[PDB]
Design an enzyme around this catalytic site. Sequence first.
Site, PDB file in Angstrom:
ATOM      1  N   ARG A 208       5.727 -35.434   8.325  1.00 50.26           N
ATOM      2  CA  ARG A 208       6.444 -36.444   9.085  1.00 50.26           C
ATOM      3  C   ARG A 208       6.575 -36.130  10.564  1.00 50.26           C
ATOM      4  O   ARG A 208       6.121 -36.888  11.419  1.00 50.26           O
ATOM      5  CB  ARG A 208       7.857 -36.641   8.539  1.00 50.26           C
ATOM      6  CG  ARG A 208       7.961 -37.270   7.165  1.00 50.26           C
ATOM      7  CD  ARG A 208       9.439 -37.531   6.891  1.00 50.26           C
ATOM      8  NE  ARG A 208       9.705 -38.242   5.648  1.00 50.26           N
ATOM      9  CZ  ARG A 208       9.374 -37.793   4.445  1.00 50.26           C
ATOM     10  NH1 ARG A 208       8.750 -36.638   4.335  1.00 50.26           N
ATOM     11  NH2 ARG A 208       9.706 -38.481   3.359  1.00 50.26           N
TER      12      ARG A 208
ATOM     13  N   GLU B 282       7.644 -31.600   3.943  1.00 45.58           N
ATOM     14  CA  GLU B 282       8.211 -32.859   4.417  1.00 45.58           C
ATOM     15  C   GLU B 282       8.293 -32.946   5.942  1.00 45.58           C
ATOM     16  O   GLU B 282       8.041 -34.006   6.525  1.00 45.58           O
ATOM     17  CB  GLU B 282       9.607 -33.073   3.816  1.00 45.58           C
ATOM     18  CG  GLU B 282       9.662 -33.119   2.286  1.00 45.58           C
ATOM     19  CD  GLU B 282       8.999 -34.358   1.687  1.00 45.58           C
ATOM     20  OE1 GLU B 282       8.740 -35.327   2.429  1.00 45.58           O
ATOM     21  OE2 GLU B 282       8.750 -34.370   0.463  1.00 45.58           O
TER      22      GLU B 282
ATOM     23  N   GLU C  22       1.749 -46.489  -1.084  1.00 45.73           N
ATOM     24  CA  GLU C  22       0.510 -46.288  -1.828  1.00 45.73           C
ATOM     25  C   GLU C  22      -0.395 -47.461  -2.187  1.00 45.73           C
ATOM     26  O   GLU C  22      -1.623 -47.322  -2.107  1.00 45.73           O
ATOM     27  CB  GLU C  22       0.778 -45.430  -3.066  1.00 45.73           C
ATOM     28  CG  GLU C  22       1.269 -44.025  -2.723  1.00 45.73           C
ATOM     29  CD  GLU C  22       2.746 -43.968  -2.408  1.00 45.73           C
ATOM     30  OE1 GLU C  22       3.198 -42.942  -1.860  1.00 45.73           O
ATOM     31  OE2 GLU C  22       3.470 -44.936  -2.723  1.00 45.73           O
TER      32      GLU C  22
ATOM     33  N   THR D  41      -1.112 -37.449   5.210  1.00 46.97           N
ATOM     34  CA  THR D  41      -0.516 -38.112   4.059  1.00 46.97           C
ATOM     35  C   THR D  41       0.729 -38.966   4.319  1.00 46.97           C
ATOM     36  O   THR D  41       1.261 -39.605   3.403  1.00 46.97           O
ATOM     37  CB  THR D  41      -0.290 -37.090   2.899  1.00 46.97           C
ATOM     38  OG1 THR D  41      -0.135 -37.808   1.669  1.00 46.97           O
ATOM     39  CG2 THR D  41       0.924 -36.227   3.140  1.00 46.97           C
TER      40      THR D  41
ATOM     41  N   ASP E 249      -0.048 -34.942  -6.051  1.00 47.67           N
ATOM     42  CA  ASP E 249      -0.834 -35.975  -5.386  1.00 47.67           C
ATOM     43  C   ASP E 249      -1.655 -35.593  -4.152  1.00 47.67           C
ATOM     44  O   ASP E 249      -2.884 -35.573  -4.215  1.00 47.67           O
ATOM     45  CB  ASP E 249       0.043 -37.200  -5.065  1.00 47.67           C
ATOM     46  CG  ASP E 249       1.237 -36.877  -4.171  1.00 47.67           C
ATOM     47  OD1 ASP E 249       1.447 -35.703  -3.801  1.00 47.67           O
ATOM     48  OD2 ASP E 249       1.974 -37.828  -3.838  1.00 47.67           O
TER      49      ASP E 249
HETATM   50  O1  LIG Z   1       5.852 -37.712  -3.640  1.00 52.61           O
HETATM   51  C1  LIG Z   1       5.578 -38.189  -2.553  1.00 52.61           C
HETATM   52  N1  LIG Z   1       4.381 -38.057  -1.929  1.00 52.61           N
HETATM   53  C2  LIG Z   1       4.454 -39.071  -0.865  1.00 52.61           C
HETATM   54  C3  LIG Z   1       3.906 -38.487   0.484  1.00 52.61           C
HETATM   55  O2  LIG Z   1       2.526 -38.148   0.372  1.00 52.61           O
HETATM   56  C4  LIG Z   1       4.107 -39.570   1.615  1.00 52.61           C
HETATM   57  O3  LIG Z   1       3.209 -40.649   1.355  1.00 52.61           O
HETATM   58  C5  LIG Z   1       5.639 -40.000   1.698  1.00 52.61           C
HETATM   59  O4  LIG Z   1       6.371 -38.809   2.045  1.00 52.61           O
HETATM   60  C6  LIG Z   1       6.232 -40.434   0.310  1.00 52.61           C
HETATM   61  C7  LIG Z   1       5.724 -41.831  -0.164  1.00 52.61           C
HETATM   62  O5  LIG Z   1       5.656 -42.689  -1.314  1.00 52.61           O
HETATM   63  N2  LIG Z   1       5.852 -39.283  -0.621  1.00 52.61           N
HETATM   64  C8  LIG Z   1       6.511 -39.003  -1.719  1.00 52.61           C
HETATM   65  O6  LIG Z   1       7.661 -39.294  -1.995  1.00 52.61           O
HETATM   66 CA   LIG Z   2       0.859 -39.977   0.964  1.00 53.17          CA
END
Ligand SMILES: O=C1N[C@@H]2[C@@H](O)[C@@H](O)[C@H](O)[C@@H](CO)N2C1=O
Ligand SMILES: [Ca+2]
EC number: 3.2.1.113
Length: 455
Positions: free
Chosen positions: A94, A90, A357, A446, A221
């Site tokens: 970020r 995380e 997404e 990501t 993912d």
């Molecule tokens: O499970 C997750 N994967 C995504 C991440 O890849 C990123 O897009 C954000 O932290 C956030 C966005 O929906 N993330 C999550 O909570």
């Molecule tokens: Ca992502």
Amino acid sequence: QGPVHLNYRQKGVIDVFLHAWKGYRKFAWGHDELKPVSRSFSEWFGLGLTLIDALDTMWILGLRKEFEEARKWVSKKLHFEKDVDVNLFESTIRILGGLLSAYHLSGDSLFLRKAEDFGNRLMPAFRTPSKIPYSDVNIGTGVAHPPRSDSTVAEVTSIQLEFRELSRLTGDKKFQEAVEKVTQHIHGLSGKKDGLVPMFINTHSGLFTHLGVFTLGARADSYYEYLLKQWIQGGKQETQLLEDYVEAIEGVRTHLLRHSEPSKLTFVGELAHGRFSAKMDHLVCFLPGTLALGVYHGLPASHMELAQELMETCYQMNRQMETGLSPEIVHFNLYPQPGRRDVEVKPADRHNLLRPETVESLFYLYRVTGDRKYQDWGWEILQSFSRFTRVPSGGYSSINNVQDPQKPEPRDKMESFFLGETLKYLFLLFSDDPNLLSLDAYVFNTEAHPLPIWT
Ligand SMILES: O=C1N[C@@H]2[C@@H](O)[C@@H](O)[C@H](O)[C@@H](CO)N2C1=O
Ligand SMILES: [Ca+2]
């Protein structure tokens, strides 16, 4: 007032960003997340998460005054000499990713200096027997450790772009070497299902755990996403990454791809010990975008057909809801029954946390196909965010009920990825300039932080 050259949709995204930022500046400045409804804030790591995640978005949207003010905060208030446990993944996607992109866009060395500082503080997480990193690390004391218990696969395989870039910029090879070790270990690890990987991995044994259960949603993912993106970042020279990605997509087609009834919407479900579950997290909507990105870079035309189908499905996950915003999870009907709709949502999953997404994939689908409908779809989704998640005093909040336009029920929280991802992808989606962060020159991490493609 905003720049005259902007088309109306980009202008609209900026208006939304400003209203959202108004709330952050007034009630949560310097804090991780804004609590718009209660006009307060919340702390996760205590590192100005929302501010850092939004740095590149502000730059890209031309909000230079706001950027400068945020830059000042980073220069005077951001201190990593803190006794706090952060999640490696995380904080990497970020903070490290956000500082790296801010550095490249602004040319301001401050962001690189902070990135190198943070990167060094994260390194103790790789001090394990398998070298697969621990999930958490205390940036101040230097002690790493697993969750309150293995590390999740997506977490250890979705920090590579960031660490690789930090090594390229600093000349310090330890970052890249550490993350590439995990990538190589994962490549030769058994326990996969035709490219599909389990959700967990033990740091001591370095072996996959929770075998036989696969999903492309939470916990997995970005693993698939980074196989392709690392390949792209490295200049398409690392064939093993490409091969693993290609195999994985085939695994998706063979084990998780199904169609709903009566409309035949293509979707990706989950598999648990042979039992298929017609359940799809909104998180899985990252796939059409990644698939299209691959096609742009030479991947099978079959990937494009799949991308278009999944984009349509993700769009419907949003549009079939009364608020026009997709819920956290969506179930699809697999068998024939007249009058039975395709999309179903459990009462517990009707929340929307302003996730990126769908709009993220719309961005890629538009960039690759040039089909204006993807922009139209994005504009509709933005309208929904404005109508059902807007907080008058400032900011936007996640909501509890996506199916009730009269009572969406705000959760009083603005995730950092709303400004870091959701609004950035929408701004870019609405651009008609293929040279604005071109798919040929940049690759997004990501958490929507663009990093340069190596030559
Ligand atoms: O499970 C997750 N994967 C995504 C991440 O890849 C990123 O897009 C954000 O932290 C956030 C966005 O929906 N993330 C999550 O909570
Ligand atoms: Ca992502």
